[PDB]
Symmetry: C3
Subunit: 232 residues, 3 copies
């Protein structure tokens, strides 16, 4: 029997161990990170534009109280694209840039300072309900030493909750007991392109500017689970 959105319900009790039913409403805020590396030489060539795990620490209000949360966003199933403007030192070139599409997965680990994430190691009856969110690509200019600047623009995917499992966010200090939410992707308008090139009408989200100026992407949800935790 439940009574409120955010609650801890004792399921079983033993001297040292207890099974707790934890139900939490959560506000998941996260962001992507990118690794953009330029090649040597005159400055017309980029060797890599790829995704990398991004952390985000924040606070929000739940039941009149301040919640402190930490997320870690990672991706997989990235697709490799490239642009070859020619082999001359002055020819614009991106050797490799990543794009997440419908064959890609975005994962967001979530932890908050409430009791539910305390010693969260053995979970059963895990259930979660999460909203969907659209991520769009911001513009990214490739400042060439001379001439007009090519500009990667567009791109978009919508994230859809598709599974949850336990995970550990290995921060610099504490290793947080977390829930890892997997999101499947659906490509959305607009497609991306690179101005001043023959590249256009491609669908997916490039790793050039996946946050598009936003401080974070937000997904609201809630979970319910039974966790076997120490009694003392």
């Amino acid at each position: 029997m439940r009574a409120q959105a955010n609650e801890d319900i004792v399921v079983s009790k033993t001297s040292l161990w207890k099974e707790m039913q934890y139900n939490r409403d959560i506000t998941i805020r996260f962001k992507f990170a990118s690794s953009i590396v330029k090649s040597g030489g005159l400055g017309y060539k980029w060797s890599e534009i790829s995704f990398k795990p991004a952390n985000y620490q924040y606070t929000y209000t739940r039941d009149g109280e301040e919640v402190t949360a930490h997320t870690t966003c990672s991706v997989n199933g990235m697709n490799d694209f490239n642009f070859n403007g020619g082999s001359l030192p002055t020819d614009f070139v991106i050797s490799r840039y990543e794009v997440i599409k419908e064959n890609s997965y975005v994962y967001v680990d979530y932890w908050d300072d409430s009791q539910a994430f305390r010693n969260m190691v053995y979970v059963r009856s895990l259930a979660a309900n999460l909203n969907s969110v659209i991520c769009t690509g911001g513009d990214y200019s490739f400042a060439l030493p001379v001439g007009q600047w090519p500009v990667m623009t567009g791109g978009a995917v919508s994230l859809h909750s598709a599974g949850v499992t336990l995970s550990t966010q290995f921060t610099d200090f504490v290793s947080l007991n977390s829930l890892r939410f997997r999101f499947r992707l659906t490509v959305e308008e607009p497609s991306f392109s690179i101005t001043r090139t023959r590249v256009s009408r491609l669908y997916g989200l490039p790793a050039a500017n996946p946050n598009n100026g936003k401080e974070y992407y937000e997904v609201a949800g809630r979970f319910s689970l039974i966790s076997l935790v120490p009694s003392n």
Copy 2:
């Protein structure tokens, strides 16, 4: 008391915790992965040839049922070799390539979807028996801009079981409770060499093409252990 190759026997049980004797025959299939990086200039030079962890997911039959397994192969203690065929821009070179020998170790993490690996965190009386396996190097052509092509060829080591400990395979999604099998190596025939050079009669397994066209290497074995796990 035992009865069959694959079984779960309750050693002792309490309302929330229980000790299980898990016995299983296992088919370990794994593989290597390599990072081959080229240097700048004309394209007659390689900067690095090193091993990197490799995952392998597969299925096989055990007592008439389909078992789903996942392995992660990593190596440590590799040896750095190199080839310097000149100073000129147009001269074939390998600045550093890894070779595993008798002073090296290969580790294979194993997990399968049977009850034995669920919540495998506290293990007593861990015992395992594993066959040995031979890993051989396949050819690897160094595609020069001009001239015929060097081809690293040969190389081999036999893996011999040398201990097991618990580990976790941190996959893009689920973090699998696994058994980490360590293997000591013995060099074997054929030695390795690089055609069109004076390199030959060297022993060990180079990182250029350690899988030798195979999809996986296979080691059959069995383990027996007692695991303290949640009752529900």
Copy 3:
């Protein structure tokens, strides 16, 4: 309830048929060291692109009550600060694109494990407390050997580490995964400042990643700790 009797001991706080709460009290000698990744700028020889900190492992043994203790530590840093020196763009101009320095806004973490009973199955801990001495880390010299000209030398720098919290962690070695305690150390910058000879860089405070160990085999922090751990009875 339970009472202490000596410096190193295991005390049964509670016991059931599969689980038990043990209080582990220990004197520890924490020995660790830093590691750095130093990379030269290709091309010819007057430029460096990186000098950063990288985690470092250290294995050692020491005595505790007449017995030999085997320990393993992993030192990592966070909140480092990025510095650089640009003495020209021409091939023959001295350049270090980025070198890290830890200051008062940085943290040094030292993960500790030893082969005693206390670290066996350490997963659920409470009443965790530790008393550690402070330790001063100073930077040794680092010469930027060049083609020609008198060589610049990164010299000086110092910070003192002060215990600022402990949490559980795992040291993931090549084989075994060690249940450990991660000690966080906040820093206070100390004299002397650091500088680079043959340049206008001087009077900067903090510990550069060039030669943080100053030739020592290890840095050592000592103390003792006490904690209650929920472990399997068998």
